[PDB]
Amino acid sequence: DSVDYRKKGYVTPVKNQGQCGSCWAFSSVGALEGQLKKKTGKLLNLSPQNLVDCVSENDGCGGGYMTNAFQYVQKNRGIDSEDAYPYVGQEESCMYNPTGKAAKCRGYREIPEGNEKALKRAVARVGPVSVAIDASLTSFQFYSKGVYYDESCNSDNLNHAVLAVGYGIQKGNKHWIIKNSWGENWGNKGYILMARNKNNACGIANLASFPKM
Ligand SMILES: CC(=O)N[C@H]1[C@H](O[C@H]2[C@H](O)[C@@H](O)[C@H](O[C@@H]3[C@@H](NC(C)=O)[C@H](O[C@H]4[C@H](O)[C@@H](O)[C@H](O[C@@H]5[C@@H](NC(C)=O)[C@H](O[C@H]6[C@H](O)[C@@H](O)[C@H](O)O[C@@H]6C(=O)O)O[C@H](CO)[C@@H]5OS(=O)(=O)O)O[C@@H]4C(=O)O)O[C@H](CO)[C@@H]3OS(=O)(=O)O)O[C@@H]2C(=O)O)O[C@H](CO)[C@H](OS(=O)(=O)O)[C@@H]1O
Protein backbone atom coordinates (compact mmCIF):
# COMPACT_ATOMS: atom_id res chain seq x y z
CA ASP A 1 0.00 0.00 0.00
CA SER A 2 1.09 3.64 0.17
CA VAL A 3 2.13 5.21 3.47
CA ASP A 4 3.15 8.82 4.09
CA TYR A 5 3.58 9.91 7.71
CA ARG A 6 3.92 13.52 6.67
CA LYS A 7 0.18 13.49 6.04
CA LYS A 8 -0.44 11.87 9.47
CA GLY A 9 1.34 14.79 11.19
CA TYR A 10 4.14 12.44 12.34
CA VAL A 11 6.92 14.57 10.82
CA THR A 12 8.53 17.91 11.78
CA PRO A 13 9.99 20.44 9.33
CA VAL A 14 13.19 19.83 7.48
CA LYS A 15 16.21 21.00 9.41
CA ASN A 16 19.71 21.89 8.32
CA GLN A 17 22.67 20.15 9.96
CA GLY A 18 25.11 22.60 8.43
CA GLN A 19 28.70 21.43 8.03
CA CYS A 20 28.53 19.17 11.06
CA GLY A 21 28.37 15.42 10.37
CA SER A 22 25.38 15.12 12.65
CA CYS A 23 23.11 13.44 10.11
CA TRP A 24 22.84 10.52 12.50
CA ALA A 25 21.47 12.82 15.21
CA PHE A 26 18.77 14.26 12.89
CA SER A 27 17.79 10.78 11.68
CA SER A 28 17.53 9.60 15.28
CA VAL A 29 15.46 12.55 16.53
CA GLY A 30 13.19 12.14 13.50
CA ALA A 31 12.32 8.51 14.33
CA LEU A 32 11.88 9.67 17.95
CA GLU A 33 9.77 12.66 16.97
CA GLY A 34 7.44 10.31 15.14
CA GLN A 35 7.12 7.76 17.95
CA LEU A 36 6.44 10.55 20.47
CA LYS A 37 3.50 11.74 18.37
CA LYS A 38 2.38 8.12 18.08
CA LYS A 39 2.29 7.71 21.86
CA THR A 40 1.28 11.16 23.01
CA GLY A 41 -0.45 12.78 20.08
CA LYS A 42 1.83 15.82 20.16
CA LEU A 43 4.48 16.87 17.67
CA LEU A 44 7.67 18.43 19.00
CA ASN A 45 11.11 19.25 17.64
CA LEU A 46 13.62 17.08 19.49
CA SER A 47 17.22 18.03 20.08
CA PRO A 48 20.03 16.76 17.77
CA GLN A 49 22.56 18.84 19.65
CA ASN A 50 21.77 16.77 22.74
CA LEU A 51 22.84 13.63 20.91
CA VAL A 52 25.84 15.20 19.21
CA ASP A 53 27.19 16.56 22.51
CA CYS A 54 26.32 13.64 24.81
CA VAL A 55 26.45 10.27 22.95
CA SER A 56 30.08 9.35 23.84
CA GLU A 57 29.22 6.13 22.15
CA ASN A 58 29.59 8.23 18.90
CA ASP A 59 31.85 10.84 17.25
CA GLY A 60 29.74 14.01 17.24
CA CYS A 61 30.02 15.94 14.00
CA GLY A 62 32.49 13.28 12.84
CA GLY A 63 29.69 10.69 12.61
CA GLY A 64 27.86 8.09 14.65
CA TYR A 65 25.20 5.41 14.78
CA MET A 66 21.44 5.75 15.25
CA THR A 67 21.30 2.80 17.63
CA ASN A 68 23.81 4.38 20.05
CA ALA A 69 21.61 7.48 19.87
CA PHE A 70 18.53 5.46 20.85
CA GLN A 71 20.55 3.60 23.48
CA TYR A 72 21.78 6.91 24.97
CA VAL A 73 18.19 8.20 25.31
CA GLN A 74 17.05 5.12 27.13
CA LYS A 75 20.01 5.00 29.55
CA ASN A 76 19.79 8.77 30.00
CA ARG A 77 16.10 8.47 30.78
CA GLY A 78 15.32 11.06 28.12
CA ILE A 79 16.24 13.63 25.46
CA ASP A 80 15.74 17.37 25.50
CA SER A 81 13.51 19.38 23.16
CA GLU A 82 15.17 21.49 20.47
CA ASP A 83 14.04 24.60 22.33
CA ALA A 84 15.73 23.54 25.56
CA TYR A 85 18.90 22.34 23.81
CA PRO A 86 19.25 24.23 20.53
CA TYR A 87 21.37 23.04 17.59
CA VAL A 88 24.56 25.07 17.03
CA GLY A 89 26.41 23.06 14.39
CA GLN A 90 29.49 22.12 16.44
CA GLU A 91 30.44 19.60 19.11
CA GLU A 92 30.35 20.95 22.65
CA SER A 93 30.28 19.44 26.12
CA CYS A 94 27.16 17.62 27.17
CA MET A 95 24.63 20.14 28.55
CA TYR A 96 21.70 17.76 28.85
CA ASN A 97 19.11 19.18 31.25
CA PRO A 98 16.38 16.88 32.73
CA THR A 99 14.02 19.87 33.09
CA GLY A 100 13.98 20.16 29.30
CA LYS A 101 13.03 16.55 28.68
CA ALA A 102 10.52 16.03 25.88
CA ALA A 103 10.82 12.30 24.99
CA LYS A 104 11.83 8.89 26.26
CA CYS A 105 12.90 5.59 24.81
CA ARG A 106 13.04 1.89 25.80
CA GLY A 107 15.89 1.07 23.48
CA TYR A 108 15.65 0.22 19.82
CA ARG A 109 14.81 -2.43 17.22
CA GLU A 110 16.83 -3.38 14.15
CA ILE A 111 15.62 -4.23 10.63
CA PRO A 112 17.08 -7.44 9.16
CA GLU A 113 19.99 -6.30 7.01
CA GLY A 114 19.11 -5.60 3.38
CA ASN A 115 15.52 -6.76 3.68
CA GLU A 116 13.42 -4.08 1.98
CA LYS A 117 10.18 -5.97 2.68
CA ALA A 118 11.07 -5.94 6.36
CA LEU A 119 11.71 -2.20 6.11
CA LYS A 120 8.33 -1.74 4.36
CA ARG A 121 6.46 -3.52 7.13
CA ALA A 122 8.29 -1.65 9.88
CA VAL A 123 7.52 1.76 8.27
CA ALA A 124 3.85 0.85 7.96
CA ARG A 125 3.30 -0.63 11.43
CA VAL A 126 5.70 1.59 13.40
CA GLY A 127 6.18 4.98 11.74
CA PRO A 128 9.29 6.79 10.43
CA VAL A 129 12.33 4.53 10.39
CA SER A 130 15.92 5.70 10.66
CA VAL A 131 18.12 4.49 7.77
CA ALA A 132 21.62 4.91 6.38
CA ILE A 133 22.55 5.23 2.73
CA ASP A 134 25.21 5.97 0.16
CA ALA A 135 24.78 9.68 -0.47
CA SER A 136 28.24 10.28 -1.96
CA LEU A 137 27.24 10.64 -5.58
CA THR A 138 26.90 13.76 -7.70
CA SER A 139 23.36 12.77 -8.63
CA PHE A 140 22.31 12.60 -4.95
CA GLN A 141 23.72 16.11 -4.18
CA PHE A 142 21.90 17.60 -7.16
CA TYR A 143 18.68 15.67 -6.83
CA SER A 144 15.57 17.63 -7.71
CA LYS A 145 12.81 15.33 -8.82
CA GLY A 146 11.69 11.77 -9.45
CA VAL A 147 12.56 8.40 -8.08
CA TYR A 148 16.28 8.67 -7.32
CA TYR A 149 18.37 5.91 -8.88
CA ASP A 150 22.05 5.76 -9.63
CA GLU A 151 23.73 2.67 -11.11
CA SER A 152 26.94 3.56 -9.26
CA CYS A 153 25.35 3.68 -5.73
CA ASN A 154 27.24 1.53 -3.25
CA SER A 155 25.24 -0.42 -0.74
CA ASP A 156 28.32 -1.35 1.21
CA ASN A 157 29.19 2.36 1.57
CA LEU A 158 26.82 3.87 4.12
CA ASN A 159 27.95 7.50 4.63
CA HIS A 160 24.79 9.44 5.41
CA ALA A 161 21.84 8.89 7.75
CA VAL A 162 18.29 9.96 7.01
CA LEU A 163 14.69 9.18 7.87
CA ALA A 164 12.27 7.02 5.90
CA VAL A 165 8.95 8.77 6.50
CA GLY A 166 7.03 6.63 4.07
CA TYR A 167 6.94 4.67 0.84
CA GLY A 168 4.98 4.74 -2.34
CA ILE A 169 4.84 4.44 -6.13
CA GLN A 170 5.35 7.09 -8.76
CA LYS A 171 4.38 6.24 -12.35
CA GLY A 172 4.86 2.54 -11.58
CA ASN A 173 8.19 3.23 -9.93
CA LYS A 174 8.33 2.06 -6.32
CA HIS A 175 10.06 4.44 -3.91
CA TRP A 176 10.98 5.28 -0.37
CA ILE A 177 10.02 8.79 0.83
CA ILE A 178 13.06 10.20 2.61
CA LYS A 179 13.56 13.21 4.86
CA ASN A 180 17.08 14.63 4.72
CA SER A 181 18.82 17.20 6.99
CA TRP A 182 20.46 19.56 4.41
CA GLY A 183 17.66 22.16 4.58
CA GLU A 184 14.53 22.84 2.52
CA ASN A 185 16.57 24.06 -0.47
CA TRP A 186 18.29 20.73 -1.07
CA GLY A 187 16.26 18.28 -3.18
CA ASN A 188 12.50 18.47 -3.24
CA LYS A 189 11.87 20.81 -0.33
CA GLY A 190 14.42 18.87 1.69
CA TYR A 191 13.10 15.44 0.73
CA ILE A 192 14.09 12.78 -1.76
CA LEU A 193 12.25 9.84 -3.38
CA MET A 194 14.61 6.86 -3.47
CA ALA A 195 14.22 3.63 -5.45
CA ARG A 196 12.48 0.80 -3.61
CA ASN A 197 12.87 -2.95 -4.32
CA LYS A 198 15.67 -2.16 -6.82
CA ASN A 199 18.13 -4.48 -5.12
CA ASN A 200 18.50 -2.41 -1.97
CA ALA A 201 19.69 0.68 -3.82
CA CYS A 202 22.17 2.81 -1.88
CA GLY A 203 22.13 0.42 1.08
CA ILE A 204 18.67 1.66 2.07
CA ALA A 205 17.79 -1.36 4.22
CA ASN A 206 21.35 -2.24 5.32
CA LEU A 207 21.27 -0.17 8.49
CA ALA A 208 17.72 0.59 9.40
CA SER A 209 16.39 1.04 12.94
CA PHE A 210 13.66 2.53 15.09
CA PRO A 211 13.30 3.42 18.82
CA LYS A 212 10.92 1.56 21.12
CA MET A 213 8.54 3.81 23.02
C1 LIG B 1 -11.47 -8.66 7.56
C2 LIG B 1 -10.93 -7.95 6.37
O3 LIG B 1 -10.93 -6.74 6.33
N4 LIG B 1 -10.56 -8.69 5.34
C5 LIG B 1 -10.42 -8.13 4.00
C6 LIG B 1 -9.27 -8.80 3.28
O7 LIG B 1 -8.08 -8.51 4.01
C8 LIG B 1 -6.81 -7.90 3.86
C9 LIG B 1 -6.57 -7.25 5.19
O10 LIG B 1 -7.51 -6.21 5.41
C11 LIG B 1 -5.18 -6.68 5.20
O12 LIG B 1 -4.93 -6.26 6.54
C13 LIG B 1 -4.14 -7.72 4.82
O14 LIG B 1 -2.85 -7.10 4.74
C15 LIG B 1 -1.54 -7.35 4.21
C16 LIG B 1 -0.66 -8.09 5.21
N17 LIG B 1 -1.10 -9.48 5.28
C18 LIG B 1 -2.02 -9.85 6.18
C19 LIG B 1 -2.82 -11.10 5.86
O20 LIG B 1 -2.32 -9.12 7.13
C21 LIG B 1 0.80 -8.05 4.82
O22 LIG B 1 1.54 -8.67 5.87
C23 LIG B 1 2.67 -9.36 6.41
C24 LIG B 1 2.37 -9.87 7.81
O25 LIG B 1 2.26 -8.75 8.71
C26 LIG B 1 3.48 -10.79 8.30
O27 LIG B 1 3.08 -11.40 9.53
C28 LIG B 1 3.77 -11.88 7.28
O29 LIG B 1 4.86 -12.67 7.78
C30 LIG B 1 5.25 -13.96 8.27
C31 LIG B 1 6.70 -14.11 7.81
N32 LIG B 1 7.51 -13.16 8.54
C33 LIG B 1 8.64 -12.66 8.05
C34 LIG B 1 9.59 -12.03 9.02
O35 LIG B 1 8.92 -12.81 6.88
C36 LIG B 1 7.19 -15.52 8.11
O37 LIG B 1 8.55 -15.69 7.63
C38 LIG B 1 9.20 -16.95 7.34
C39 LIG B 1 9.93 -16.69 6.04
O40 LIG B 1 9.01 -16.14 5.07
C41 LIG B 1 10.59 -17.98 5.54
O42 LIG B 1 11.36 -17.69 4.37
C43 LIG B 1 11.48 -18.55 6.64
O44 LIG B 1 12.05 -19.80 6.18
O45 LIG B 1 10.71 -18.74 7.85
C46 LIG B 1 10.15 -17.53 8.36
C47 LIG B 1 9.41 -17.85 9.62
O48 LIG B 1 8.56 -18.75 9.63
O49 LIG B 1 9.68 -17.22 10.65
O50 LIG B 1 6.32 -16.47 7.46
C51 LIG B 1 4.96 -16.43 7.92
C52 LIG B 1 4.16 -17.56 7.25
O53 LIG B 1 5.01 -18.36 6.42
C54 LIG B 1 4.43 -15.04 7.58
O55 LIG B 1 4.46 -14.90 6.10
S56 LIG B 1 3.08 -14.87 5.26
O57 LIG B 1 2.64 -13.47 5.08
O58 LIG B 1 3.37 -15.52 3.89
O59 LIG B 1 1.98 -15.62 5.92
O60 LIG B 1 4.11 -11.26 6.04
C61 LIG B 1 3.05 -10.51 5.47
C62 LIG B 1 3.53 -10.00 4.14
O63 LIG B 1 2.82 -10.17 3.14
O64 LIG B 1 4.64 -9.41 4.07
O65 LIG B 1 1.22 -6.70 4.68
C66 LIG B 1 0.60 -6.09 3.55
C67 LIG B 1 1.17 -4.69 3.30
O68 LIG B 1 2.36 -4.51 4.09
C69 LIG B 1 -0.91 -6.03 3.78
O70 LIG B 1 -1.07 -5.09 4.85
S71 LIG B 1 -2.04 -3.89 4.65
O72 LIG B 1 -2.22 -3.54 3.26
O73 LIG B 1 -1.39 -2.69 5.37
O74 LIG B 1 -3.32 -4.22 5.22
O75 LIG B 1 -4.46 -8.31 3.57
C76 LIG B 1 -5.74 -8.94 3.58
C77 LIG B 1 -6.01 -9.54 2.25
O78 LIG B 1 -5.93 -8.79 1.26
O79 LIG B 1 -6.32 -10.74 2.19
O80 LIG B 1 -9.21 -8.31 1.94
C81 LIG B 1 -10.35 -8.72 1.15
C82 LIG B 1 -10.20 -8.34 -0.34
O83 LIG B 1 -8.85 -7.96 -0.73
C84 LIG B 1 -11.61 -8.11 1.77
O85 LIG B 1 -11.48 -6.68 1.64
S86 LIG B 1 -12.60 -5.93 0.90
O87 LIG B 1 -13.47 -6.81 0.15
O88 LIG B 1 -13.41 -5.32 1.94
O89 LIG B 1 -11.90 -4.94 -0.08
C90 LIG B 1 -11.72 -8.37 3.25
O91 LIG B 1 -12.71 -7.43 3.67
Report the 10 Å Cβ neighbour count for 212: 12
Rounded CA separation 107/92 (Å): 25
Instruction: Give the domain extent around 143.
Output: 1-213
The answer to whether the CB of 1 is under 6 A from ligand 1 is yes
Rounded CA separation 117/114 (Å): 9
- 147-148 and 173-179 beta bridge pairing: unpaired
Rounded CA separation 114/88 (Å): 34
Q: Which residues 6+ apart lie within 8 Å of 61 measured at CB?
A: 19, 20, 21, 22, 52, 89, 90, 91
Residue from 181, 143, 127 nearest 13 by CA? 181
Rounded CA separation 87/155 (Å): 30
Rounded CA separation 84/90 (Å): 17
Rounded CA separation 115/208 (Å): 10
Asked if 204 and 176 touch (Cβ cutoff 8 Å), the reply is yes
Rounded CA separation 140/105 (Å): 32
Please give the distance, rounded to the nearest whole angstrom, from the Cα atom of residue 122 to the centre of ligand 1: 13
Rounded CA separation 91/60 (Å): 6
Q: Identify the active-site residue in 20, 160, 200, 202.
A: 160
Whole-number CA gyration radius for the chain = 16
Asked if 3 and 168 touch (Cβ cutoff 8 Å), the reply is yes
Asked if 159 and 136 touch (Cβ cutoff 8 Å), the reply is yes
**How many domains, in total, are found in the chain?**
1
Asked if 63 and 207 touch (Cβ cutoff 8 Å), the reply is no
Q: What is the largest CA-CA distance in the chain?
A: 49
DSSP assignment of 158-202 equals: --EEEEEEEEEEETTEEEEEEE-SB-TTSTBTTEEEEESSSSSGG
Q: How many residues does the chain have?
A: 213
**Alpha-helical segments (H) within the chain:** 23-40, 48-54, 66-75, 116-125, 138-141
Q: Which residues 6+ apart lie within 8 Å of 185 measured at CB?
A: none
Asked if 184 and 199 touch (Cβ cutoff 8 Å), the reply is no
The answer to whether 175 is a known catalytic residue is no
Asked if 50 and 77 touch (Cβ cutoff 8 Å), the reply is no
The CATH number for 130's domain is: 3.90.70.10
Ligand 1 atom 67 nearest Cα: 1
Q: What letters, b where the CB count within 10 A reaches 16 and e where it falls short, cover 51-75?
A: bbbbbeebebbeebbbbbbbbbbbe
Asked if 31 and 11 touch (Cβ cutoff 8 Å), the reply is no
Ligand 1 site-directed mutation target among 121, 125, 129, 176, most atoms within 8 Å of CB: 121
Rounded CA separation 17/89 (Å): 6
**Alpha-helical segments (H) within 41-104:** 48-54, 66-75
Atom of ligand 1 nearest to the CA of 121: 68
